[PDB]
Subunit: 461 residues, 4 copies
Amino acid sequence: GFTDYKVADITLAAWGRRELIIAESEMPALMGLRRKYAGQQPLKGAKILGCIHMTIQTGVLIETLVALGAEVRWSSCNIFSTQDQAAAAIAAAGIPVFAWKGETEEEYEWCIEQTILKDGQPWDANMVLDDGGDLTEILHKKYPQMLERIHGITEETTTGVHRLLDMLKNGTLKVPAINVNDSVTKSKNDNKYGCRHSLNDAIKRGTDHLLSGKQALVIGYGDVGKGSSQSLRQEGMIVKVAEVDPICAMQACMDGFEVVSPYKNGINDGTEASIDAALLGKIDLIVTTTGNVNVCDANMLKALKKRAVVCNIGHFDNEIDTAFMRKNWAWEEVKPQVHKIHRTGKDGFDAHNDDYLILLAEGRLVNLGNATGHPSRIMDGSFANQVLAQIHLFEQKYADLPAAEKAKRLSVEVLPKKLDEEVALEMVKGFGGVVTQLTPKQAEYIGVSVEGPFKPDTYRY
Amino acid sequence: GFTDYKVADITLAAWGRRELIIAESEMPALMGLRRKYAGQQPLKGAKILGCIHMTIQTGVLIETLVALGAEVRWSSCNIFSTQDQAAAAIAAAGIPVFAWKGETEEEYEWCIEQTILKDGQPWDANMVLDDGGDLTEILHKKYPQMLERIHGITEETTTGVHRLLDMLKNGTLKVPAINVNDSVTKSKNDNKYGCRHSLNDAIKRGTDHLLSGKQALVIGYGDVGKGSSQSLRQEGMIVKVAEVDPICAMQACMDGFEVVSPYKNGINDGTEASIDAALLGKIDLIVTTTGNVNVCDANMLKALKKRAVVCNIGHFDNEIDTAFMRKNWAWEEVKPQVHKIHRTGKDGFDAHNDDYLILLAEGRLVNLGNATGHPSRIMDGSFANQVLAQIHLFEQKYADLPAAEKAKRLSVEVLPKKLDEEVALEMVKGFGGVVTQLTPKQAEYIGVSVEGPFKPDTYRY
Amino acid sequence: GFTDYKVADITLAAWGRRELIIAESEMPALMGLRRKYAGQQPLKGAKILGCIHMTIQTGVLIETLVALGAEVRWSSCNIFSTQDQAAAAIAAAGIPVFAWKGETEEEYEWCIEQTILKDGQPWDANMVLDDGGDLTEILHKKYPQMLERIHGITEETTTGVHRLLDMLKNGTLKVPAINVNDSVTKSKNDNKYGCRHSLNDAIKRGTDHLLSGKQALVIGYGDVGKGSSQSLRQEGMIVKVAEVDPICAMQACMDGFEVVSPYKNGINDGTEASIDAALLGKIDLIVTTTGNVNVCDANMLKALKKRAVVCNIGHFDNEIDTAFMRKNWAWEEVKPQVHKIHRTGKDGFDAHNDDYLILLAEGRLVNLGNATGHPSRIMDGSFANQVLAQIHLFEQKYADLPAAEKAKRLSVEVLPKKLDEEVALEMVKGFGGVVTQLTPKQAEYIGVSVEGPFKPDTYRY
Amino acid sequence: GFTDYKVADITLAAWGRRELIIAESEMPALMGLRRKYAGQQPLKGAKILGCIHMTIQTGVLIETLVALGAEVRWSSCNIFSTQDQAAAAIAAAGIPVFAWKGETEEEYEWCIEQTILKDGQPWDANMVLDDGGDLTEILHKKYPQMLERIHGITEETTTGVHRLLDMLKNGTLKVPAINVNDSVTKSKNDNKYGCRHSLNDAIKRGTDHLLSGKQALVIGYGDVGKGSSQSLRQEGMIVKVAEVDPICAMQACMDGFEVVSPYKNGINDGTEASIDAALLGKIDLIVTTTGNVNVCDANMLKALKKRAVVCNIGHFDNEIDTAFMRKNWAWEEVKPQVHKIHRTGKDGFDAHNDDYLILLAEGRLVNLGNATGHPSRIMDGSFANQVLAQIHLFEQKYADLPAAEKAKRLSVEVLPKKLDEEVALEMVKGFGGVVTQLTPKQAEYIGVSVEGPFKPDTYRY
Ligand SMILES: NC(=O)c1ccc[n+]([C@@H]2O[C@H](COP(=O)([O-])OP(=O)(O)OC[C@H]3O[C@@H](n4cnc5c(N)ncnc54)[C@H](O)[C@@H]3O)[C@@H](O)[C@H]2O)c1
Ligand SMILES: NC(=O)c1ccc[n+]([C@@H]2O[C@H](COP(=O)([O-])OP(=O)(O)OC[C@H]3O[C@@H](n4cnc5c(N)ncnc54)[C@H](O)[C@@H]3O)[C@@H](O)[C@H]2O)c1
Ligand SMILES: NC(=O)c1ccc[n+]([C@@H]2O[C@H](COP(=O)([O-])OP(=O)(O)OC[C@H]3O[C@@H](n4cnc5c(N)ncnc54)[C@H](O)[C@@H]3O)[C@@H](O)[C@H]2O)c1
Ligand SMILES: NC(=O)c1ccc[n+]([C@@H]2O[C@H](COP(=O)([O-])OP(=O)(O)OC[C@H]3O[C@@H](n4cnc5c(N)ncnc54)[C@H](O)[C@@H]3O)[C@@H](O)[C@H]2O)c1
Ligand SMILES: Nc1ncnc2[nH]cnc12
Ligand SMILES: Nc1ncnc2[nH]cnc12
Ligand SMILES: [K+]
Ligand SMILES: [K+]
Ligand SMILES: [K+]
Ligand SMILES: [K+]
């Protein structure tokens, strides 16, 4: 008689459950934590508000937290990223989840609100797991009294960490947080290799376009930009890379990419004259990866080669000026998450017009919107970190401390390197890899313990 | 009338000078510093003891320091790494240099001593530029009075930095140092991409072996191991990777390599029984990249496939147990830096014996020993950092500080990120790359200045 | 009032039509033929029985033949390869098509029969377009009177060509054929690069498995094996290749793959003892590419690592002994075209059993079964060849020739090189590529016409 | 007391002999033929004029022919391709060889003449082995009476085969020939993979330039162009490809290269206006691979980016207009086979001029001129074919036939596929590869013998 959920189609549960069982076999770090901590129940009494893409991989995360003793209430952090079979399997297990693929913005906020409210009143939540900071922001702005009982936030992604650090700098962050993004087994695994796997996957599913031999422009060359450029280059695209950070641009050059700017001499002065129209007129695919605002702007969209594909793999859709396209150009839906944007005008469209762009996922995160996001064996690292971070902040019991004790603990921290290494070891063993053990003499020679950690905290990998 | 040098053949100078003029055109960051600072003469009065591979690239470094006002006395930090035409060109310019390819160990020490002593007495040195820490160690052990007047050390390489940090922790470091290795435009340029360019280069020059289709084992997957594995994989080798650090091993797996140990279950217990003989018996090439001791040990050498190539690209030769091979097996020189090691015994050799290994550079740094090390356009980054570090420590004038002020400044530091970025920008422009400029709104959106720095100090790239 | 069709769901037609309009923009060679020949109507009077995967790409092929004057009746050549929106769009256009994704074998035969018969009697067919030879075989065995009036067969694929050549050698082939497979713009485009695009695509859609870091075994290294191995290697798989042809195996070695056999010393003597159990126990993915029989046999399936993925990209499913798996092991459907094969026995299954294989598309062509097959821009080459071949055989009018003249024309031929080159030129222009024109002196120097052909017929590319 | 030779330095013989002994271990097909045929002496009585690059690999070929009973007289087919240690080792073995690195054109012709003449009179030669057709041409034009006693020519390379086919077409070829180039274990091994190994090798040895991140233009995309493009792309160059053959251009696009022409719209009308100056002004490296004339012409050389590298890997230097550069621009030798070409004029040069090109090997085959050509394990295939071809033509005894028998045998033929496969098998075993044996049922299923051949003669691989 469980009704405390909202999903697209509960009859997808058995399919979702089959995929969860496969995903468990692909997630040895996460399932190792389930086995290790199940007897101890370290999350007994935890009540976790979770806001992260309701995929099969998030399902394994949810059920690990529950297996460790937690209660949860769950929503997705993006309108297109839910896998409806994953949501159904979680709801069928008696877990409150409010998520479906293809929400409206109003439905998106309503879903988050259904996690925060139980029976019309604030749930007695005491932990937060977030991806991008939307739940964290709603709590601080609209439900500040609830933060009086919450011990911590564990934040998944680069954009969400930025938002937390802004709150900390401004003195508005109310509970301590763990930056899960910056574990090496997250940032340099999920952010990079996850996008390598799933960017070309999403473009193929949405368009079935041949990529070999065509010209791509990747805006950004951080972790997501690195993985995205490789996703395209390994398919045979001719990839050009734009960057504002000269160190990242240096890496792009050494990795074998030509570094270009959409703007003449790199100067974005707001005029059409500043656009390198020759460059943009040759691009078949543009991908934004920055976490910044308006990096694929209206003048760039006007200058792109006819029939170019436009997509964003950063957290928020404002990387592309889709608002300009909504105001000026006609949208022809090809299928869900695939639209032809007719640059002829806004008053209907000609089904045979040759002057259109193909926009994927309406500019929302394309790997999750047009495919299934990162694969389970990659998300294993990110979500093992999430579980460890939830255990730590819940055990620390910040909400129970005296006000003086709270002041010294109000921070944004990362996990210790030793735990990062232990997650990595389980990942390596999952591939069948065999890590060598240092001899006592070798450990002494390089100045480390045989057990690790093996690198100083300054090490960049 | 200049005689204050010792090189292989001074008649090679004109050839060296032609290569220096080409290298200047490949080193825009370093030559940009030469142009920016020449008028100001920031190194006027500096007297630099330099100990680093006497290559064409080091020649451009030397002449940049001199162009900024320094005097120098120079030696190589490896017995096989000098390019004799580079050494000749520097000596022909009136610069004291003591370096040739193929020194003995006694000659190597004598060359360092010739930089320290001028006319039989300590030179009036006040700065140190070092690669690996050998000059730094000799000064601390044998010439402490000279360190009294030295303002700082700028150290090039991972191994040298480790030695500095040991001295700092023991309270034996006498002057402050800059860790040049850990600029991103050094570590994630030189250490990685430099070895990608130069490892396969050296193996080809030493052996002319086809690499495609053959089996390689790379010991280590830090920056050098990453570049080395790519150097071989891009040639079509089937590359396996060993590691003690599970995070580095995770990267190897995600990069498409099989992670293996020379020892059964990774346990190095000193017996032949622990060697994975089946694995080592299929390896055609082994490369050590660790900075550690005895990572290609006697039992591994005994188990390698007949005619395997053995080489080391870490700083010191003790990565491979070459002492064991000198004691037990006969060495047939093919040509300089290429030896067949006959596993039949040590009492002469059979020129037609099939049971040998090919050892490159007698186990010393193979890229420099059997080829020319990293290319100018990569060394541009490392050496622009060296020049900036020399300017900073020389301007700080630590030797002239009172004892109480010395105590506050005795440290090992890295260059600020802003300078790292400015070096990278010159490198990118050298490729013809165009970096984009943030708009004021974008810079505000991500919380940075339009001029940078663009990343927090914690960022790993 | 059109009812002469059978598809899954006619309401998918508008979606299919949108994808056809996109595919037209990705198929410049095929659309160029449509424009070049539309006025001349070279297929006026042609009545084409077509049997080839009812995809969007085949839709553009069908509508090109119709635009040139043909009437057609169409079926798919595989039970899982139809895209239902493509079938719907073709039926909605008034074209007889009998095809849906997920036919039974009985439905598959019924669909072919519906093209052959119209209103219960033989259609007035005079041309055949086939992929794999199934329609060709049915006509020869069951409808010889129909072949009397058929001018030729244009055969798409390696397996179908082999079947034609068998009939020719036995004197049972009744009408001439064009081997479309062996145009360079087919075999060395479609067979190789098509599988490079679509193999990893299908595995991702079926399983969402990370491929990087895992072990693959590709059986075969012809055109399909070459593209398949690249599809996996570019994702970071560690790919091993099996072959019976030592020249193809040599290419695999030089391409950077380890060449292995499932059998000890390559000897397939039918016993379990001949299986290299150590090798197969480390394989995460096996792909068959051979066009041969039982190349992934029962003993290999028994020896594979638990949870390995098993798939076939050759034309027919008998490359894998799926009959053995149907007889002995329980099948758990995950979703359409994805089955867990439980090696515990056949009397039901345990949903949590760890000892299963994942079989894709029930062993049928995996790229079409689990994804969408090759992309439009690659199929452009194959299908431009098909149109040219249909024009040529239809113009030759073999059925109308006297017996003595038929005897001189009964053959299996390829298209002339000049047409192969003209197809390629349109493909290159589609990428924006610019082919250089020889000067008269250069053309004389190498002995060719400025217009081509540029290579002798013996050239292998 | 052997004096019938001319080499650079006979004291290099011991070094050459050590490298020959290593090369034997890298050439299993060739050494397998030595072992197989040594007892039978199938070349007893053969007297072979040989004209092919006097490398270590050619040394193993020579000594295989001698071991099979032949006498030989040898020269190089290029002025820069000899390895002086290889020439010395052969001369020290008592084999007549006339070859050194850095011959003049006059010395080149004199060396060929020393093979043709013994003691001032024509040698009683009866077999010819040639690479490029220079010896074959001299025999036909200047020594036609010698061809009356010669049983055949075995020709190594694409350009030499073209010359033979021209003679055959004109009725001027006097003896039958075997096209060794067109074995698959030659053309699709040597021509492609050999250049992949040795192009980047030669550029690194000549210039030590970083290649990653720089722009290359490869003229041609046949076998040499394919291997050359990969040599550069795998180092991280951004490679553009020019072609006159649209099928080869199609392959370039699908392999992930942008296809461009040096001429606007591909039209080479002889004017400077036709040069795409924007394209050429961005190219850092141009490589000619065509076997054609003037594919890197004077107007292209004028338009290249300052400091671009120019080289040719086709057989003859006339691919580049070096004559134009000799007449107009000053040459500054950096070192042997490396020249800066100063575009400021011809009246001396400024050592610091920035407007120069770097020409490698004076436009002669760059892999052999600036490095050591293809590696032994690749040349194994080519030279096993050469030995088989020499055995066959010598056994056929064309010169001894009646005039009527000669007419029916005057042809240019390739080796049978069965032998091509047997060479390939030895190559595969050299990598440790294991070829699978077909079962009787499988061989029947695909219509081949279990022993091969496995493909029809039309197969392109
Ligand atoms: N879709 C996914 O699965 C996924 C995964 C991880 C992270 N993310 C999101 O992707 C975004 C990027 O994350 P990251 O970890 O790569 O961050 P990052 O900071 O490592 O990289 C962002 C890069 O963008 C560059 N950049 C900023 N403004 C630019 C501009 N105007 N033009 C060009 N380059 C510009 C920055 O210099 C930086 O190198 C964030 O929004 C993050 O939350 C998405
Ligand atoms: N030849 C060159 O041009 C060049 C360039 C840069 C640095 N170096 C030298 O190369 C060495 C490595 O430098 P780095 O910057 O890559 O250091 P690093 O710390 O980044 O990498 C060394 C790696 O070796 C691994 N390792 C240690 N012991 C091991 C063992 N027994 N088995 C397997 N892996 C083991 C460590 O876990 C680590 O990841 C140093 O000696 C450095 O000075 C050489
Ligand atoms: N799925 C697709 O889209 C697609 C595309 C083109 C062709 N095909 C089909 O794929 C198959 C292969 O086509 P192809 O053009 O690559 O043929 P091919 O003749 O070029 O290659 C087949 C290869 O299999 C090898 N082989 C045969 N028996 C073997 C065995 N027991 N073990 C290992 N290797 C073995 C052969 O030596 C040969 O090199 C055919 O059935 C063809 O019709 C499928
Ligand atoms: N250096 C080496 O080790 C080596 C090895 C093998 C062959 N070769 C030589 O290399 C040359 C090429 O041999 P191949 O086997 O690759 O021949 P190929 O016929 O396979 O390729 C030559 C290519 O050049 C193209 N081409 C011709 N004129 C052109 C032009 N003006 N612009 C652009 N492309 C043009 C042709 O279309 C063709 O595809 C020959 O001279 C051959 O003897 C050298
Ligand atoms: N599959 C996935 N599940 C959850 N969050 C993700 N972020 C990226 N891919 C994801
Ligand atoms: N190493 C080599 N020896 C002889 N001929 C060659 N052609 C190309 N490389 C060669
Ligand atoms: K997924
Ligand atoms: K160098
Ligand atoms: K498709
Ligand atoms: K060689």
